[PDB]
Amino acid sequence: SLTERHKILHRLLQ
Amino acid sequence: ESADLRALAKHLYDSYIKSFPLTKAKARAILTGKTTSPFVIYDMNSLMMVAIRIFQGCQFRSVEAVQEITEYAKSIPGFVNLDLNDQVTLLKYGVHEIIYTMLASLMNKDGVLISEGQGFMTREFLKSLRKPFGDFMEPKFEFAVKFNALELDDSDLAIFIAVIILSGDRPGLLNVKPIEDIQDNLLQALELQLKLNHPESSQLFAKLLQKMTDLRQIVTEHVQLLQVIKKTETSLHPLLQEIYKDL
Ligand SMILES: CCCCc1nc(C(C)C)c(CC(=O)OCC)c(=O)n1Cc1ccc(-c2ccccc2-c2noc(=O)[nH]2)cc1
């Protein structure tokens, strides 16, 4: 849910 | 150990050189004129050659810096093996603290380099912007002058910002045990690096550690300052939006 509430940040990590 | 602590310091220094455009070594040489000169902004006229203009243009590099810090984080040994949810938490709560550390390198008592050193904005001009915008930078300037009197170089700063990213007490962290065991190891690298890089400053480690709490409160006071703007000043970049929400 952290990666769902931070889609831009989550995508910069992958 | 020790020999491996030195290898980690070199690894982080390399990564830091690769991720950030302006090192402290370049910035200082620009600020002191020793470089082989930035445009100087001191009022509205020298800017166009208004507080919203500054405020919105500042978001530009801020977005780019979250990207650079995120890439630097991904190179910290162990970091990409952590639960991906906790990777988001550490970056959410650390990016601003890292911005303010790196911002100090670009500051003196009299102003701040901007646009990768191609400009210099004066502290007087920032402090003279209409309320409440005039107070946004002053807490950064007073932290920067104290922090620069420690006289760290980039090789020290590389490990220091790694220590800031790997804080075990961030809110919402799922599994702190693996985060705390990386930071303890980075704190060990920092302690050893400061012994080597500054054999004369007995308690520079202790002095440096106490700055980490200074940063935390600049971010707290900044966030409270920004809530008032959003209430009384009628945009924010979606990635700044996602970092500030519930922060
Ligand atoms: C609200 C927070 C204020 C911060 C801030 N305040 C100013 C002034 C108005 C005081 C400007 C100037 C500016 O753009 O206003 C245009 C007229 C500014 O950009 N930011 C954002 C910023 C973000 C990241 C970095 C950074 C980080 C890590 C490594 C390197 C850098 C870096 N080194 O050189 C760069 O350009 N970025 C630096 C600066």
The neighbouring-strand residues paired with B21 are: none
CB burial class (10 A; 0-12, 13-18, 19+) of residue B96? buried
B75 Cβ contact partners less than 8 Å away, ≥ 6 residues apart: B11, B12, B15, B19
Name the one residue in this structure whose structure tokens are 């995508």: A11
Both structure tokens of B72:
């630097």
The neighbouring-strand residues paired with B112 are: B107, B121
Rounded CA separation B52/B49 (Å): 17
Please tell me whether residue B101 adopts helix, strand or coil conformation: helix
CB burial class (10 A; 0-12, 13-18, 19+) of residue B199? exposed
DSSP letter (8 states) at residue B51: H
**Contact yes or no for B39/B118 (Cβ under 8 A):** yes
DSSP letter (8 states) at residue B123: H
Both structure tokens of B180:
């705390």
Write the CATH number for B217.
1.10.565.10
Rounded CA separation B37/B194 (Å): 32
Rounded CA separation B25/B8 (Å): 21
Domain hosting residue B23, numbered range: 1-247
**CA distances (Å), B197 to each of B91, B148, B154, B192, in order?**
28, 16, 11, 9
Name the one residue in this structure whose structure tokens are 């102003």: B111
Our CA-based measurement puts residue B184 at a distance from the nearest CA of chain A, in whole angstroms, of: 23
Of B84, B239, B246, the CB nearest to A8: B239
**CA distances (Å), B144 to each of B57, B92, B189, in order?**
21, 22, 24
Q: Are strands B119-122 and B39-41 parallel, antiparallel or unpaired?
A: parallel
- E strands, chain B, in order: 39-41, 107-108, 111-114, 119-122
CB distance A5–B245 less than 8 Å?
A: yes
Of A5, A8, A13, the CB nearest to B84: A13
Amino acid at B127: K
**Contact yes or no for B214/B198 (Cβ under 8 A):** no
Q: What resolution does the deposited structure have, in angstroms? A: 2.4
Nearest to B58 by CA among B237, B232, B221: B237
Amino acid at B109: K
* Structure determined via: X-ray
Please tell me whether residue B200 adopts helix, strand or coil conformation: coil
CB distance B85–A13 less than 8 Å?
A: no
How many domains would you assign to chain B?
1
> Which residues in chain B have their CB less than 8 angstroms from residue A12's CB?
66-67, 70
Rounded CA separation B140/B180 (Å): 28
Amino acid at B75: S
Phi-psi region of B213 (alpha: psi -120 to 50; beta: other; left: phi over 0): alpha
Q: Are strands B111-114 and B119-122 parallel, antiparallel or unpaired?
A: antiparallel
Give, in degrees to the nearest 5, the angle at Cα B102 between B40 and B207: 125
B176 CA → ligand 1 middle, Å: 31
**Contact yes or no for B66/B239 (Cβ under 8 A):** yes
| Helix or strand run (H / E) with residue B116 | none
Please tell me whether residue B239 adopts helix, strand or coil conformation: helix
Rounded CA separation B153/B147 (Å): 12
Cα dihedral across residues B182, B184, B187, B193: positive or negative:
negative
**CA distances (Å), B56 to each of B42, B97, B241, in order?**
18, 20, 13
Please tell me whether residue B27 adopts helix, strand or coil conformation: helix
Our CA-based measurement puts residue A2 at a distance from the nearest CA of chain B, in whole angstroms, of: 5
DSSP assignment of B103-115, as one string? HHHTEETTEEEET
